[PDB]
């Protein structure tokens, strides 16, 4: 029988080509989105367009370390992420060009930091974030969409960002569901990075079956609900195909997203700049 969830209730949604016929077994994987909105809140003149997103993007590495090292103190079961997340071994034998851009061995975890192998030093030695991000754009879901977790126009990583608020996402694939561990992770992230007036829903799991000058402020609204719904249809099948995983006769379970809000100050926004981007922009 399908896995049991008490507080978060079930919901079904198959993309076209009580209990539906296909909702029988356990899902191929659960999807957990940590949705991050960030801003350099005290803005100034003399800041360049790049300063809108470089400093916010530099926090993805610390955020990923925090998620990966999270342990449920006082646990009655699953303790760490490694005990619960989906394990991947090797990309397809063809398509190895995405080595050091997608996780081969271990936990399935995607984030913008993957563009730099989750290496803050490599990010700091990078003079053109836009070029690095778009280096592999051409169909199936793009590498930028896979790593950012958002359509791409919502991200705000561009030279024409007027609101100066950048959003991205960390994507976790989980083999098992643990209410205690997942609630602990959400509580940890909301303690570390409180969101001002976040109203995201947190009580529904969506099962998807695939057939064949002034200060800026971070806002949370109905446009941020079920953000994954504005990704491509082939997003998840294409993500899982890279690891020889098929969603043909099976389904996945998307859990409610965990909000995160980052406020950065001019000191960090300055300390992060690569000296060679001042001359260009």
């Amino acid at each position, epitope marked *: 029988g399908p896995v049991e969830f008490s507080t978060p209730v079930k919901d079904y949604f198959p993309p076209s080509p009580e209990r539906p016929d296909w909702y029988v077994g356990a899902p191929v994987a659960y999807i957990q989105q940590i949705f991050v909105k960030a801003t350099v809140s005290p803005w100034q003149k003399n800041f360049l367009a790049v300063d809108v997103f470089r400093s916010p993007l530099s926090r993805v590495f610390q955020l990923v370390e925090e998620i990966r090292n999270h342990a449920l103190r*006082d646990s009655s079961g699953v303790k760490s992420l490694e005990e619960v997340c989906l394990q991947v071994t090797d990309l397809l034998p063809g398509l190895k060009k995405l080595r050091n851009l997608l996780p081969e061995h271990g936990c399935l975890l995607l984030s913008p930091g993957n563009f730099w192998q989750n290496d803050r030093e490599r990010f700091n030695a990078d003079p053109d974030i836009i070029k690095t991000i778009h280096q592999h754009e051409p169909t199936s879901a793009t590498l930028k969409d896979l790593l950012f977790g958002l359509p791409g126009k919502y991200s705000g990583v561009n030279l024409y960002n007027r609101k100066r608020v950048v959003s991205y996402t960390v994507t976790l694939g989980l083999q098992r569901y643990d209410s205690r561990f997942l609630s*602990s992770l959400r509580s940890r992230l909301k*303690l570390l990075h409180p969101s001002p007036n976040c109203t995201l829903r947190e009580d529904s799991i969506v099962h998807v079956h695939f057939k064949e000058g002034t200060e800026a402020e971070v806002t949370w609204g109905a446009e941020d609900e079920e953000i994954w719904r504005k990704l491509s249809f082939r997003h998840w099948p294409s993500l899982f195909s890279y690891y020889n995983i098929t969603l043909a006769k099976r389904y996945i379970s998307i859990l409610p997203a965990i909000p995160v809000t980052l406020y950065l100050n001019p000191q960090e926004a300055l300390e992060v700049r690569h000296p060679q981007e001042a001359n260009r922009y």
Partner: antibody
Amino acid sequence: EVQLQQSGAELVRPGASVKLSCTASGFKIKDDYIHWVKQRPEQGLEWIGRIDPANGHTRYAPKFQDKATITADTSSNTAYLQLSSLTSEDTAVYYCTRYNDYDAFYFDYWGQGTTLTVSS
Amino acid sequence: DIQMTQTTSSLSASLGDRVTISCRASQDIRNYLNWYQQKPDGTVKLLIYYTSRLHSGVPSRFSGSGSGTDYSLTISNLEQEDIATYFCQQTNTLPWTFGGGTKVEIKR
């Protein structure tokens, strides 16, 4: 409306065994851990242990590993703490509580407290 | 394992006065400190969690601050209802440890 009703005051002989009880109302004990705390004047409060009623998985402070035994009945919505090999040093007030946030681990709601007296 | 110590076991104050309780941890606890209030009746009630966060229903005159090893609760204006004992509990390392309570009383 969350309440944790506790049993009445207890008087027992040294060497006997007591079972204090704590009945929840307004929520199901299955949904949270249930903890027992001990207040003793001139020593303050100290943590005894907790139980996860969904799993029946208990944990204790190392002081009470051989002293306390925590259990829970979900049908009756009641947690229990059993003290064994009682001595005078077990005369104290025992609080039943829980927590609701699983990173902060704050005890949001408490029972009124049960006084246990051990005297010949 | 972690020993929490409150400097003053008793404190005398007056209505409308600013009061401050403080406690020190034997080691870093990464802001995992909760503040509880116990009435003379014996009923306990959570005041603060994670060193600054107000529990729902707590009057806004209570506040918390601190870091590293040193933490402090503050009552902006002592009300007649704020006569009680105050405990600080650390939830950083697994066996939860409370600090010896600090009593608050009127001047006499």
